[PDB]
């Protein structure tokens, strides 16, 4: 009784695809972000925004297609279809890069939608909402990289473009201009990601190799029952093994699994903080002591100064085509180059 | 090199000389460690989410598990019940053995491919090269993001080991 | 002298590096894939100049 | 004065000490280069 309660009833039915209140936000926005990416990478160019072909229609492959960012001249325009730039024209809207903000924004709200889904399903099933909490790290990364970072720069143009090779370009740009590998926040990020993979691997392997024999099959997968009360592998034997191999070992299963949440989630959050810094070009670019010494002493060389040379190469050789709005013309004679190459 | 910045040097020169980012084995490697991190967090959070209540609010939930206890410490049916609704019922693992095997296999295989990526680019079978792959009706090159990547790689190439090359091709 | 061109690269803390810039530097390009144990060097000084530590490690 | 009923004892077990010290020391090992710059 009461349309609100009837609606709630319907939204929360246990169907094949749970909808929920959260679904009202999630499904349209996720569908539009995915659909936008497929439409753009299949049919849409980047000629007028980047001087790039970017679709299957133009001859790109899966690795090279992208939905590219708008031209730098658009600033941080929302670039709404009915906005002052496209003025309701769908074709021009595509040509001006409207699909990029379409996808970034519908995607952001879709991520909000999904995390809300995690909360709603957790609440309905009666478990603690740690999955949502963990999803905060993907959120932080998306928001810092696709929204905050370009908002700090001149325009959406320098946001990552939605494509495989485009993303690779984003990586190389961050090396060349930001010296991003030197940034301790990126490093913590890397430690969290690789450490996460390490934990995934080692935990999986450990459980699979300390299994109790709970059946006669040589394929041991059948010897498990979801409702069984007993642990399917030996924590005691696992603990002894790792204690003797590595010196230390988990002894608490609850702590083990919390730690598996903590490591990659914390890593991604730290990387997000670094990117927020880079939005402002607030880089970990140099070590001043290094530079003072090297400037005064032409025989002093480290891997740090070598990498700066590489960066200078990247900037000079990539900027004219990567930043066409600057109209860079770098005569041959000013290009930095080592001997012969 | 056995050092942090030296490691980055190695990576950048590697990219110049092999276009490793466009190599499918390095891509599988990335899928392996991104995926590994994802599934790490996912598993951690699900098991954590389904811990059976054994403690009060003023103590750590971890005291709810005792080392060597025979009973499983979380509700795998609840965990699965959440996960299947989050996606659809069948993407989920209800079988802990299959699930843990997946957790082992995804990063291990992905990283195997990363290793093989480095190990075969060792013999200069390099990443995909789509430099100037798109051409218009007249014959003008239409750049793709692959060509921008090429501009960056060129920067790395011409600057690295700036005093070491006397001849125009870097053949090792 | 990592690249074998008498252009020695400093890797250690005492010689001007911090934790991020420091390294044990790969053996010389003049050595190539030749086995370079300590006893192949005329001296520890030679050994160090050519990146012997890297190979040993 | 009446004793406050909201008080609670605090704990840090040895393993948490080792984890925490590892975290601090490794963070310092990481950030110190940037502190000296």
């Amino acid at each position: 009784r009461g349309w609100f309660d009837i609606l709630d009833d319907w939204l929360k039915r246990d169907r094949f695809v749970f909808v929920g209140w959260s679904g009202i936000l999630l499904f349209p926005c996720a569908y539009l972000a995915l659909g936008g990416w497929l439409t753009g990478t299949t049919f849409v160019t980047s000629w007028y925004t980047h001087g790039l072909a970017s679709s299957y229609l133009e001859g790109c492959n899966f690795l090279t297609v992208a939905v590219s960012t708008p031209a730098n001249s658009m600033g941080h325009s929302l670039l709404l279809l009915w906005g002052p730039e496209a003025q309701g024209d769908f074709t021009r809207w595509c040509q001006l890069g409207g699909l990029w903000t379409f996808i970034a924004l519908h995607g952001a709200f879709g991520l909000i939608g999904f995390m809300l889904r995690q909360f709603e399903i957790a609440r309905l099933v009666g478990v603690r909402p740690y999955n949502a909490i963990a999803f905060s790290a993907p959120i932080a990364v998306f928001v810092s990289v696709f929204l905050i970072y370009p908002l700090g720069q001149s325009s959406w143009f320098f946001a990552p473009s939605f494509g495989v090779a485009a993303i690779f370009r984003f990586l190389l740009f961050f090396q060349g201009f930001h010296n991003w590998t030197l940034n301790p926040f990126h490093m913590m990020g890397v430690a969290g990601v690789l450490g996460g993979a390490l934990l995934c691997a080692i935990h999986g392997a450990t459980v699979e190799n300390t299994l109790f024999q709970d059946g006669e099959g040589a394929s041991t997968f059948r010897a498990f029952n979801p409702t069984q009360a007993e642990e399917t592998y030996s924590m005691v034997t696992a603990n002894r093994f790792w204690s003797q191999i590595f010196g230390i070992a988990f002894s608490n299963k609850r702590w083990l699994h919390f730690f598996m949440l903590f490591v990659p989630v914390t890593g991604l959050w730290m990387s997000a903080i670094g990117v927020v810094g880079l939005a402002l070009n607030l880089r970990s670019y140099d070590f001043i002591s290094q530079e003072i010494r090297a400037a005064e002493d032409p025989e002093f060389e480290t891997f740090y100064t070598k990498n700066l040379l590489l960066n200078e190469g990247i900037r000079a050789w990539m900027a004219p085509q990567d930043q066409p709005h600057e109209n860079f013309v770098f005569p041959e004679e000013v290009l930095p180059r080592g001997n012969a190459l | 090199p056995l050092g942090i910045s030296g490691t980055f040097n190695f990576m950048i020169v590697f990219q110049a000389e092999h276009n490793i980012l466009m190599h499918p084995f390095h891509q599988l490697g990335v899928a392996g460690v991104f995926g590994g991190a994802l599934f790490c967090a996912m598993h951690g959070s699900l098991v954590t989410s389904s811990l059976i209540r054994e403690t009060t609010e003023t103590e750590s939930a971890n005291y709810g598990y005792k080392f060597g206890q025979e009973e499983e410490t979380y509700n795998i049916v609840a965990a699965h019940g959440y996960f299947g609704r989050l996606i659809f019922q069948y993407a989920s693992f209800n079988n802990s053995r299959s699930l843990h095997f997946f957790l082992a296999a995804w990063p291990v295989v992905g990283v195997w491919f990363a290793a093989l990526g480095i190990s075969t680019m060792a013999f200069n079978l390099n990443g995909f090269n789509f430099n100037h792959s798109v051409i218009d009706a007249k014959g003008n090159v239409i750049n793709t993001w692959a060509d921008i990547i090429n501009r960056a790689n060129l920067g790395m190439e011409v600057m690295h080991e700036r005093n070491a090359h006397n001849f125009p091709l870097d053949l090792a | 002298d990592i690249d074998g061109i008498r252009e020695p690269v400093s890797g250690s803390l005492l010689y001007g590096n911090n934790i991020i810039t420091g390294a044990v530097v790969p053996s010389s390009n003049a050595i190539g894939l030749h086995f370079y144990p300590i006893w192949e060097a005329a001296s520890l000084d030679e050994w160090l100049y050519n990146g012997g530590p890297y190979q040993l490690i | 004065m009446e004793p406050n009923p909201n008080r609670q004892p605090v704990e840090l077990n040895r393993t948490s000490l080792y984890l925490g010290l590892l975290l601090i020391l490794v963070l310092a090992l990481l950030f110190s280069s940037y502190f000296f710059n």
Partner: peptide, 30 residues
């Protein structure tokens, strides 16, 4: 003093490895 600092922190970490391994709280079965 920079070098001394780096080496000091590293040394403390190794010491910690020693204690965390040989002077851990022993796991006990219930």
């Amino acid at each position: 003093m920079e070098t001394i600092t780096y080496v000091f922190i590293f040394a403390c970490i190794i010491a910690l490895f020693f204690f965390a391994i040989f002077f851990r709280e022993p796991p006990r079965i219930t």
